[PDB]
Amino acid sequence: MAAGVGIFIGYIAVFTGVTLGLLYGLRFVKLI
Amino acid sequence: MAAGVGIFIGYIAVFTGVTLGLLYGLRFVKLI
Amino acid sequence: YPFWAQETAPLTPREATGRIVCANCHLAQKAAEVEIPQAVLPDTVFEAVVKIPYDLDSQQVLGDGSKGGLNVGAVLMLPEGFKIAPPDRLSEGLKEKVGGTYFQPYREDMENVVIVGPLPGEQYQEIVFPVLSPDPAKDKSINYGKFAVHLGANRGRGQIYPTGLLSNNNAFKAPNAGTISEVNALEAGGYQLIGTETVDIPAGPELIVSAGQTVEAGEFLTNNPNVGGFGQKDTEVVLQNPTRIKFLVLFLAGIMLSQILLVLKKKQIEKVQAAELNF
Amino acid sequence: YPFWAQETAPLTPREATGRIVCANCHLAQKAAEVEIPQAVLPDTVFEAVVKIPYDLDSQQVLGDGSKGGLNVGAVLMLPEGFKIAPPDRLSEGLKEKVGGTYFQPYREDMENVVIVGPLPGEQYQEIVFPVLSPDPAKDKSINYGKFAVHLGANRGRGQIYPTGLLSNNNAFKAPNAGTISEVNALEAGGYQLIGTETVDIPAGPELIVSAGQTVEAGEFLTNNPNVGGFGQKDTEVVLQNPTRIKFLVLFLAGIMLSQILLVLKKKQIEKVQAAELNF
Amino acid sequence: SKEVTESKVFQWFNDRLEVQAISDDIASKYVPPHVNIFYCLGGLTLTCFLIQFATGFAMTFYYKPTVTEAFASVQYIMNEVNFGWLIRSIHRWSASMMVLMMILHVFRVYLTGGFKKPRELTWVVGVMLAVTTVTFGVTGYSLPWDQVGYWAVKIVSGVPAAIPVVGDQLVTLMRGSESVGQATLTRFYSLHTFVLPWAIAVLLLLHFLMIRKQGISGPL
Amino acid sequence: SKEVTESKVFQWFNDRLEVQAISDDIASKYVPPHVNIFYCLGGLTLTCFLIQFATGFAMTFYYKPTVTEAFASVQYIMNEVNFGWLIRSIHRWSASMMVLMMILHVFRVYLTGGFKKPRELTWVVGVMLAVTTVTFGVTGYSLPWDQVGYWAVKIVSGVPAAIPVVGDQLVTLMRGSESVGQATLTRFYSLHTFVLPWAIAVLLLLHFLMIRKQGISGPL
Amino acid sequence: SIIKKPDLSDPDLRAKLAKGMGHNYYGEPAWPNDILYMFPICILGALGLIAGLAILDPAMIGEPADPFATPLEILPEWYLYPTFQILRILPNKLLGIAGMAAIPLGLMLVPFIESVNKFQNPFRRPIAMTVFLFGTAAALWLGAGATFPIDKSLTLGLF
Amino acid sequence: SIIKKPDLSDPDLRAKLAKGMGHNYYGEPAWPNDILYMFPICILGALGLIAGLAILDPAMIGEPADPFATPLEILPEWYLYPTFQILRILPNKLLGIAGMAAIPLGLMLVPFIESVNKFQNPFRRPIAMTVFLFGTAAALWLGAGATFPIDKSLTLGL
Amino acid sequence: DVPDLGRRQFMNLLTFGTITGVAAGALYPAVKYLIPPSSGGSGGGVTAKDALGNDVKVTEFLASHNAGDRVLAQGLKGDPTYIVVQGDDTIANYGINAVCTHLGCVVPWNASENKFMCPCHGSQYNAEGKVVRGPAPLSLALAHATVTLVLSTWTETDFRTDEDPWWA
Amino acid sequence: DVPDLGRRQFMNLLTFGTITGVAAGALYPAVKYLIPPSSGGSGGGVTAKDALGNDVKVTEFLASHNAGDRVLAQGLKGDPTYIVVQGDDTIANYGINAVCTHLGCVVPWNASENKFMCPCHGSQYNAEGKVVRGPAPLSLALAHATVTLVLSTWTETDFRTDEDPWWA
Amino acid sequence: MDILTLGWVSVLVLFTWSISMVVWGRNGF
Amino acid sequence: MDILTLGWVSVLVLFTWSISMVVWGRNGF
Amino acid sequence: MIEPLLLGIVLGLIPVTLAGLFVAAYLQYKRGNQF
Amino acid sequence: MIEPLLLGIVLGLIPVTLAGLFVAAYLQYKRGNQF
Amino acid sequence: MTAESMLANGAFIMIGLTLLGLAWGFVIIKLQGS
Amino acid sequence: MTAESMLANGAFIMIGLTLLGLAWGFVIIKLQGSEE
Ligand code: HEC
Ligand code: HEC
Ligand code: HEM
Ligand code: FES
């Protein structure tokens, strides 16, 4: 309930980071 | 197998007769 | 005989595999037919015609060793509630048709399974069973519907007695291979074959293997004089409810009246459509 | 006491209706709660806190008749395979937390059902059971899944002895209606009452029905001195397989990646459509 | 009403769902003169299936699909339940008549060139419907758990044991166990009452949709 | 593959069945700006039913609807069958989430005026769908034949007895007998696996046909 | 308006007729002439025939299953008589499986094997008719043999 | 593309809009933008949540049914908590049946009772929203009380 | 010269009324099938069955149960019934239907307080079935024990509430 | 720039391959669920069952059969296997699997002809199981019947056809 | 006056009459 | 750290992320 | 089990249906089509 | 029986869905439509 | 019928009844003409 | 998260996570820009 908050924050951060990375690296290579 | 033939003949005759009677009666009373 | 089936299998003549226990001793298999009505009404007497066919010009060997005619026998397993009609209820025409044939219930309270025989085959190749159908209206443990009728019929002598011994109405074999070379009539039609290997051929069969020849192991020493045989057959009989048929007739007549009315309605709509075209 | 439950119901402390046998002699009803973790790992020592709330200041009539404190006791029916962890498996913190409380398996091979008590309720408001979850990987008779943990906890003196004789911690009732019209203290705090009416009252309860008046059939003659009660709490615990959670996390991460890729594909298709309209 | 002749409350539905669109769609099709009495066969198959959908439905209220009660439940239907004999016998006879009508429908379709271009997919889905109907019959033959049905399933289920590698796995999959027992009865009841009704419904939907789209075949 | 892009072995299917027609019909629909995330709820309800159609399907291969084998079959699914715990738990959870998504879908429909004219029939069919799902869970709550399900049915099945005229007759009709037992289990299993799946399929077809015909409701 | 002639002056109907479709656009109207008045006739006929067969020849309960006793005669339903026959006379069980599985797979190739000509009349496709007649005769012969001892299942008795 | 504006110059579309229908003819295209790319997102989310709940909170087996021993607390599924509560608190069992059955039959009259006004926004339907909020609160209160003894079931422990 | 609305409606009525008669004659068997068959015996032909479904003999109750105990057995209409031991004998002339008259739960016995206490809502019945407390509207039914066993239907007037048997 | 056919096809591949991976990960439990559980007893450790499902007791099995009598009982994988009484003892070294090798019928034993004769088509076996007549392609499977009853899977060389066990 | 004969004949004539009515209503074979 | 917490968090983040992806993909709420 | 009535129905309906189909095909063969 | 996690999910998703629907209604009520 | 072994008899009856159904449909068609 | 009873906590978490999911969707919309 407490370390779960940290895991939630890290999990959201990791998936937001990979979302933005895929978006910008696929728009960069004109794929999307 | 023999009286059955008679029953079948009579039964066909009866239902054909009522069929024709209904058809000609409804033609007579302008229902058809 | 049927009572040997009563003694060997006293609970029922039909095993769980559907095979009548008469085949344990009667080895040959031929045709045996039963003419049962497709449907019978409750509390009505009907004849079951058991045909036990075999040519009347073929004579089998007898126990002593001489040849002679055959004797038919049968077991008819009817559905529960059916039984041989008493002489009081069956008609005079059926009375002269069944003759003086004797039927036993094969067991007490098991009157649906009726045995008969041995009867001579010269006049009993066709046996009439005056079966009496039960009425589910009086008996509440009996229901209408389709049920199985089993039959097992035999013509000749059996190969094996209830004590396991072999009759003379079969082909005899060798215990093993050897050199017998000893054929002699044992004061009758039987032989005593004795390298030295003990075997006895009864008076019935006739030796086929020549003396002084090295016979194989388990080979036919004599021919097979089994003229008769045992054959079984299962059919189905419908214990029918007359009320069912009455309501069925009413239902089908209503269906056909509906069909006629449908065709008349189509004719009326055809005339209406022809009017709508010729405006 | 729980050993009286072992004697009254030597098989199971629970009936098929779900009621714990404790309520058979503990007529009152109170609140009892258990903090079982929703999910536990196999072969993992975990604490189950059984709280038996009652007011510490409130005092009940003792066995002799005087007021006194309340002793608490409980039965915890852990799922099949669970057991109180042996002192060696407990960590130092948990060992210090549980204290010197003594637990019993209530039966042979029924170590999952654990009784405790009587314990002084002044300090044992909460009793920490050091439960040890089983290991389905080793124990082939135990499976992972959600199981029911029943709890029956009592804090007051029982009303009925194992022989059926009532205790003094209850309100007494007249058997029938009568004008008993007599009170006499039997050289102690416990007075006795003497149509023909025979009612005896120990030193526990206090009278509310005056003397020399009509007593109806079955009315509360005395005050109800019970201040405690017995309560049940049916809860659930999940014996969880860590491999299931690992594969669940992997599967959900795959789902989230798939959703991200679906949104990216939608963005690409929107980009394509925005140019196809620019014709 | 023939399709729609004279209605006033019908406007409430027509303003919302436009039922007259369905009316004018149904009344726009025509039956060509080359349609014989033999074109009624496929629909008859459907009729029989509907009976199987009906009388089978009823028999699901009393049949117990377990090896200790399947035979008992069947004879309870036949003897104790009101008109249970009629429902069960209708189910059997209409299964047989479904297969017969389907065979005659195949004969008609082959003998009128109803499968040729552009009706290849209709014929393929028809063959799949035929396989589904045969599966209905096979899985329903063992449901009574009488001796004939039990031995028929024990024979047909051990047939895949001839395939060299995947034979044992296939036999186990069809039987639900090593041998024909309770698992086989449970799987066959699920096939007969759940799997195959939905499969044949999907196949019938495809079949009828293709027939509706492409119409009936041309004259011979 | 987006809608249709460069499908050219596809000319066969388009020539026979003209499936470019349904392709263009599907691609001719638009989603208005006012459609927010709450319009995904009803579809989620359907999603849940699809899961219930699958996992429940699977549990028909191992569950035996008999009072002497129902509970044992359920515990056999949980303990012995591979991923049987997963299938059964998914079934229960997706039943609960079906009903929850249904309630949220009703909240969306009412709080967006989606039931107003001309969508009264859609709301009526939806209420019938809700009744079907509620009775679906009612019939399935006792299939395990544990204490909870058996006693819940024994409680809810004797309720109609308060009706004076046809009370006990209704109680006997739902229970399949005078008392809750094997007949009740068989009838409830037939309702759960056969009757109500078809009823809810027909109601879902009507619901979706009305929605497709009339489209989504107007902006708020 | 009894029969509507095909309007060949319609380009869409002409295209459909060239493609093989469009035969549901002429003749008697489907509704209500056929679907409403002729379909229920066949429905009621089927219902009456099946109910009469059920009443006059009710289904038989049979004997309870015995895993230890094989019946003398075991048979599937009638339509499985040929395939069952293929199972019991073919010595190679793999060949029996192949023969049983080649019926559904061979029947799906009929619209593609016979895609050489657009002739729908049987008298204009004699090879197809010979193959179909041979297939019907073979299926009926195997089904008849399935009700015979395995020795006589081939010749059915031989006169 | 981005969005298609409603073509009000179209007569059929305007007629549909006047009738309340025809709203699926403007905005973002349904395929593949939403049906092919947004629907699978929700389907995968629902499947993942249901599988996660199944793994982290499996379905318990229970105890075999005993016709002679009713359990201490018997309850239907959560969505039957309100109606079951009605059965508990209405002493007239016929009235309890009527009240339980008036929910599905009472909802079927909602589109016809509220056919007075064309408005769809909740803030333009004061009486309808008052009734809806009162009914939702009452249903939640009955469902919450269903998990209480029949004594304090009307106060939720006050 | 053509069928107008009236004649067409009359022909429709005739044709589809005959079809509806056929349909009713075909649906009567289906409805009669879906109604469970009456095979519970009779009101006086239901014996006392145990948990396993076997009848409990009156002779067995000696040395098998204590004195004054009340034990559950299958009774009239299948619902559980408390067969009462009278302490000296083994049974009585009546058996108390254990199904609660409020909702339907089986009411357990409570020897200590001499009352039937429903565990779901706390309703109380006395040692003979009469309502004492709780939300129960009616009193527990009575099963007339016969062999001293068969739990026939008790139709004699109530010896508890002084009225006709509500269960009958 | 606009994503051309190649880029859109690659992006489709990525998205729907992740979709396919998730779908396969979800379907693996579904496929493994429909596969029957690995609970077919034990290929070498299952005792002998009678038609009533009970263990057949050797003491009951002894002194209950004649010399050279073969009665079949449930065995390996539920297949009926004959437990031969050779005349002196009540057991033998081997158990002949009654399930025929032609279709799957259970061959009965005729002690009259001292042979296993299939009833379905007339396949015949010798006293030990070696094929001598009929269309049965291979010989009847054997087992190990040991007690002092447990029958285990046969692995040693076939003492009848002089070959390795085809069933294995 | 045989009831079994009456039922069999009724079924047979239903088959024949259904065929004949489909032929008559559709006005040809 | 914990594994039960890890699974619970995974399910919770899946719920949150499904909502977030539906919102982002449809470009608003 | 063999059902003689069902097999009789099958063997009476198959040949006559085939004969009728061939007769209808012949009748359409010896004349023209609808257009 | 009572399932606490499921009841928590229900009691969390009902009010938030109602509040979100009312908020979306308010946002569409303070603003116009497309046509 | 009231006679079993309805295989050959059943086949002949089905053939004859199909032919008679066709024939009687045509007979009624001919007799219905005004 | 490895608690004992998740009725109140479950409801609060569900509400908070729904709101957070909407907020994070809008955050990603803001952080995706318009065109690079
Ligand atoms: C008895 C007189 C007949 C005749 C002449 C026909 N059938 Fe049927 N039919 C049924 C169904 C479900 C369909 C498919 C519906 C669809 O295509 O969506 C058909 C189709 C036909 C056609 C072709 C219609 C078309 O549009 O191409 C024809 C010419 C045809 N049938 C002839 C269903 C049934 C029945 C259901 C109970 C019955 C009875 C019949 N059909 C009987 C007949
Ligand atoms: C072995 C125990 C047998 C059983 C079972 C059945 N039969 Fe038999 N039968 C058997 C033998 C050894 C003999 C001949 C004995 C002798 O001393 O000759 C017979 C004879 C008959 C006959 C007479 C044949 C004739 O006289 O030519 C009949 C009619 C007969 N058996 C009938 C019969 C039937 C119907 C059976 C089944 C119920 C049956 N037998 C069983 C040996 C055995
Ligand atoms: C299994 C049950 C149900 C399923 C699968 C389902 C599914 C759907 C779907 C997919 C839609 C399209 C719009 C959307 O998704 O929001 C919809 C709309 C609708 N639903 Fe349902 N629903 C179900 C039950 C209900 C219930 C219980 C009601 C009402 C009590 C209802 C009434 C409606 C109405 C009126 C609409 C149209 C609203 C509009 O167009 O704005 N449905 N439903
Ligand atoms: S199993 Fe077929 S011949 Fe023996």
Residue numbers in the entry:
A (entry chain E), B (entry chain M): 1 to 32
C (entry chain K), D (entry chain C): 1 to 194, 201 to 285
E (entry chain I), F (entry chain A): 3 to 222
G (entry chain J): 2 to 160
H (entry chain B): 2 to 159
I (entry chain L), J (entry chain D): 21 to 168, 173 to 192
K (entry chain P), L (entry chain H): 1 to 29
M (entry chain O), N (entry chain G): 1 to 35
Q: From the publication, what sentences describe this entry?
A:
Cytochrome b6f (cytb6f) catalyzes the rate limiting step of the photosynthetic linear electron transfer (LET) chain in plant, algal and cyanobacterial thylakoid membranes, connecting the light-driven reactions at photosystems I and II (PSI and PSII). The cytb6f complex uses the so-called Q-cycle to couple ET between the PSII electron acceptor plastoquinol (PQH2) and the PSI electron donor plastocyanin (Pc) (or cytochrome c6 in some cyanobacteria) to proton transfer across the membrane, conserving energy as a proton motive force for ATP synthesis. The Q-cycle involves the bifurcated transfer of electrons from the PQH2 donor bound at the oxidizing (Qp) site into so-called high-potential (2Fe-2S centre, bound by the Rieske iron-sulfur protein (ISP) subunit, and heme f, bound by the cytochrome f subunit) and low-potential (hemes bp, bn and cn, all bound by the cytochrome b6 subunit) cofactor chains. Here, we further our knowledge of cytb6f structure, function and regulation by determining cryogenic electron microscopy (cryo-EM) structures of the cytb6f complex from the extensively studied and easily transformable model cyanobacterium Synechocystis with and without PetP.
To circumvent these difficulties, we developed a purification procedure based on solubilization of cytb6f from membranes of a recombinant strain of Synechocystis producing a C-terminally StrepII-tagged PetA (cytochrome f) subunit using the mild detergent GDN followed by Strep-Tactin affinity chromatography. The subunit composition, oligomeric state and cofactor content of the purified cytb6f were verified using SDS- and BN-PAGE and UV/Vis absorption spectroscopy, which showed the four core subunits were present in an intact and dimeric complex, but that PetP was absent. The global architecture of the Synechocystis complex is similar to that of the complexes from other cyanobacteria, spinach and Chlamydomonas. At the core of the cytb6f structure are seven transmembrane helices (TMHs) belonging to cytochrome b6 (helices A–D) and subunit IV (helices E–G). Surrounding these are the single TMHs of PetG, L, M and N and the membrane anchoring helices of the cytochrome f and ISP subunits, with their extrinsic domains projecting from the membrane plane on the p-side of the complex. In the case of the ISP, this domain extends from one monomer to the neighbouring monomer, forming contacts with the neighbouring cytochrome f subunit and stabilizing an interlocked dimeric complex. Comparative superimposition of the two structures reveals displacement of the C-terminus of the PetG subunit, which moves away from subunit IV to accommodate PetP. In our Synechocystis cytb6f structure there is clear density for the ketone group on the end ring of echinenone facing the exterior of the complex, protruding into the thylakoid membrane, which is not present in the spinach structure.
